[PDB]
Design a binder for this molecule. Sequence first.
Ligand SMILES: CCCc1nn(C)c2c(=O)[nH]c(-c3cc(S(=O)(=O)N4CCN(C)CC4)ccc3OCC)nc12
Ligand SMILES: [Mg+2]
Ligand SMILES: [Zn+2]
Length: 326
Amino acid sequence: EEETRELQSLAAAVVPSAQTLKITDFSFSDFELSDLETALCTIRMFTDLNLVQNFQMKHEVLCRWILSVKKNYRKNVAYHNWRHAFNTAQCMFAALKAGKIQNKLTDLEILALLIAALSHDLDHPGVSNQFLINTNSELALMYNDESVLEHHHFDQCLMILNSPGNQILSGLSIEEYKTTLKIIKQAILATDLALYIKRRGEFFELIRKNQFNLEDPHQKELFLAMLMTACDLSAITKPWPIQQRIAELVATEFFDQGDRERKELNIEPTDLMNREKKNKIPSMQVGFIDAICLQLYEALTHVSEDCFPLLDGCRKNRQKWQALAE
Ligand SMILES: CCCc1nn(C)c2c(=O)[nH]c(-c3cc(S(=O)(=O)N4CCN(C)CC4)ccc3OCC)nc12
Ligand SMILES: [Mg+2]
Ligand SMILES: [Zn+2]
């Protein structure tokens, strides 16, 4: 049996310190790590955020839950796979520790954010919401064309949290368990960039006016949404060699969607989805940075100056892509 053999390699392995694993570093790369090592790093994130302790999680159950999450990503999808989820969670961990956000949030909020980060792209098919709408997918029918993928990832998140031996939330009060599932749903839906674009203006306005206040529950929920997007997009902040490699993965997934469009829908893909247009990736990345990323990382740095490395890396990669676009 291959599954029991993975569980045993994992629950008996020593979990190295966060310092040894480099998971506190905003610049962290997963590329040299084995699958088992990514699982050990995940355990370390739950432990050093005091979640295992504060929520009385049994080791074996956390181990089983992590391996269930990992297995429920599609390995053949080029970008939206377990490594992206793992890296998103790692960025969350770095933001909370190095970025000093941990002290601004409750243990219950942190718990939800970490589970949401790990689960937020579960079972991603490697095509966009717009593709799912255009093909009349059963998912888009179930969810009325609204954040289709994200509703699906949340469904998958609940399926895993409820599977026998994977119940990492069992130590909570019933009221706190319900509140936590609601925060997880909000966090996963927030990763729909359509919702990011709708909500960002309010966030930026509060910061511009010098009025942002995390003690206000509405502003706190807005912040959690923004933080999820910041972690989700964080490959754009990484050291140049890592960003170049990840950008190639993103483009591979987009081009594969375009190939499906050309055959299943008989349409001409747009340049973003057309492999013929690979030479345009530098200009497309500069556009992505300018339209979406820069202002988000600027805004996050206002909330915590210790998150500056994310902004710094984003700006460095903009220069690198712009030089290739010329
Ligand atoms: C859903 C994927 C979001 C995303 N994550 N990361 C790390 C990237 C990235 O590096 N690039 C792009 C990207 C965005 C645009 S875009 O801003 O123009 N954009 C197209 C996609 N939609 C959904 C939003 C707008 C164009 C090209 C891109 O990648 C080329 C490798 N998207 C993401
Ligand atoms: Mg997603
Ligand atoms: Zn994602």
